[PDB]
Structure 1
């Protein structure tokens, strides 16, 4: 028994087990659902494109794991600033049956000086999600924002507009989660005092058990070792699962 084994099981149970690939199929999503039911316990969720939600729901139900949440993505991956498009996609994700929607913040608009559109877009999408008892995560795309001031500002605006989680990255740009970006976002959660109502999700590039342990260590430091539960912490990852299971002897 090691800290690495303990952190690896913890991380596994916080995973949004993800496939968001150009060649995704029903068959691949079904296999992903089976993978989410691991020999050491269930992941917290899967994360898939909206069109796969109904077959995923059926698959999770039929294998006896209806408690595995179905997350999806909207305004994705580009984070455009057209609220009508973001909201139409979010309403469709809800209609497909999403439990959680991860919407991309309009980060290029923010970089260009538009703080208002990011607030309005997140608020509109939160309104739809809240009306359906769906949790809203907001992807701010730290690898494109780059500057600590912009990462803090995007996080702050998303929280003020009602984000239930803030998420680092889409996984569809070159640069995704870093420990530095993660720490900045979690410091915003702490500084605003919203740790009871806002979770954190690093996504993209988290591939090994040692990586997961490093990201969890930041949460334990800033909030206490009990804070990072499924309502407050998720890993957006895929190949990470095999690394965690290997660390656990499976």
Structure 2
């Protein structure tokens, strides 16, 4: 047993195994579901576009892993400031059968000085999700926000509005998760004293076992090594799984 082996098994079990591509099909999503069932255990979740939720649910059930959660995305990837649209998409995700909805915060509106629309958008989507026993993650798009003060503010607004998780990135812009962005966002969780109710999810560009290991190190430093369970930590990733399995001998 090695520190890398220990972190890699932990990371595997925290993955939101993702496919969000223009050419996605049912077949591709079925294959993803099979990939999430590994010889050492299951990923925490899959993350797919809403229209694929019903076929994914059926696939996960037939292979005997109904406990793999189904996450999806709304207001995505653009993070527009139309609350009605974000909410309608979130209600549709719930109706398809999502376990978790990852909504994009209206980051450009924040950058232009409008803090209120992000509060209102997150709150509206949280209310819909909580009524359905669905978890809400909020994607703030740290690579577009760029400045520490704006990363902190988007995190704070999201948490105040009811986010169950704060997530770095869509994976669809040039810059996604970084260790510094992860530290900033986790410091907000710490500063607001919301460790019990808010998780953290780095997403985009987390490609290798060693990458995953960098992010868990930060969590363990800040909150102790027991904090990062599946309710409090996820990896938004794809290729990372194969890297983790190699680190583990599988």
Please classify the TM superposition score into its range, dividing by the shorter chain length.
over 0.9
User: 1:6-17 alignment to 2 at 5 Å?
Assistant: 6-17=6-17
- Following TM superposition, by how much is the alpha carbon of 1:132 offset from its aligned partner in structure 2, in angstroms? 0.3
Q: Kindly provide the CA deviation profile for residues 135-168 of structure 1, in whole angstroms up to 9, marking residues without a partner as x.
A: 0000000000000000000000000000000000
- Following TM superposition, by how much is the alpha carbon of 1:117 offset from its aligned partner in structure 2, in angstroms? 0.2
Q: In structure 2, what is the Cα distance between the partners aligned to 1:213 and 1:190?
A: 21
Alignment of 1:35 onto 2:23: no
Q: In structure 1, what is the Cα distance between the partners aligned to 2:215 and 2:24?
A: 28
- Following TM superposition, by how much is the alpha carbon of 1:175 offset from its aligned partner in structure 2, in angstroms? 0.6
- Following TM superposition, by how much is the alpha carbon of 1:109 offset from its aligned partner in structure 2, in angstroms? 0.2
User: 1:15-94 alignment to 2 at 5 Å?
Assistant: 15-94=15-94
Q: In structure 2, what is the Cα distance between the partners aligned to 1:188 and 1:66?
A: 33
- Following TM superposition, by how much is the alpha carbon of 1:70 offset from its aligned partner in structure 2, in angstroms? 0.0
Q: In structure 1, what is the Cα distance between the partners aligned to 2:125 and 2:203?
A: 21
- Following TM superposition, by how much is the alpha carbon of 1:46 offset from its aligned partner in structure 2, in angstroms? 0.1
- Following TM superposition, by how much is the alpha carbon of 1:232 offset from its aligned partner in structure 2, in angstroms? 0.1
Equivalent position SS for 1:228: coil
- 1:168 corresponds in structure 2 to 168
Q: Kindly provide the CA deviation profile for residues 26-54 of structure 1, in whole angstroms up to 9, marking residues without a partner as x.
A: 00000000000011000000000000000
Equivalent position SS for 2:186: helix
Q: In structure 2, what is the Cα distance between the partners aligned to 1:101 and 1:142?
A: 19
Q: What is the alpha-carbon root mean square deviation over aligned residues?
A: 0.2
- Following TM superposition, by how much is the alpha carbon of 1:180 offset from its aligned partner in structure 2, in angstroms? 0.3
- Following TM superposition, by how much is the alpha carbon of 1:14 offset from its aligned partner in structure 2, in angstroms? 0.0
Q: Kindly provide the CA deviation profile for residues 2-32 of structure 1, in whole angstroms up to 9, marking residues without a partner as x.
A: 0000000000000000000111000000000
Q: Kindly provide the CA deviation profile for residues 182-206 of structure 1, in whole angstroms up to 9, marking residues without a partner as x.
A: 0000000000000000000000000
- Following TM superposition, by how much is the alpha carbon of 1:249 offset from its aligned partner in structure 2, in angstroms? 0.1
Q: In structure 1, what is the Cα distance between the partners aligned to 2:43 and 2:88?
A: 29
**Structure 2: runs of 5 or more not aligned:** none
Q: In structure 1, what is the Cα distance between the partners aligned to 2:24 and 2:39?
A: 25
Q: Kindly provide the CA deviation profile for residues 64-119 of structure 1, in whole angstroms up to 9, marking residues without a partner as x.
A: 00000000000000000000000000000000000000000000000000000000
User: 1:108-187 alignment to 2 at 5 Å?
Assistant: 108-187=108-187
Count of matched residue pairs: 250
Q: In structure 2, what is the Cα distance between the partners aligned to 1:162 and 1:217?
A: 26
Q: In structure 2, what is the Cα distance between the partners aligned to 1:76 and 1:38?
A: 29
- Following TM superposition, by how much is the alpha carbon of 1:172 offset from its aligned partner in structure 2, in angstroms? 0.5
**Structure 1: runs of 5 or more not aligned:** none
- Following TM superposition, by how much is the alpha carbon of 1:241 offset from its aligned partner in structure 2, in angstroms? 0.1
Q: In structure 2, what is the Cα distance between the partners aligned to 1:159 and 1:144?
A: 19
- Following TM superposition, by how much is the alpha carbon of 1:62 offset from its aligned partner in structure 2, in angstroms? 0.3
Equivalent position SS for 1:226: coil
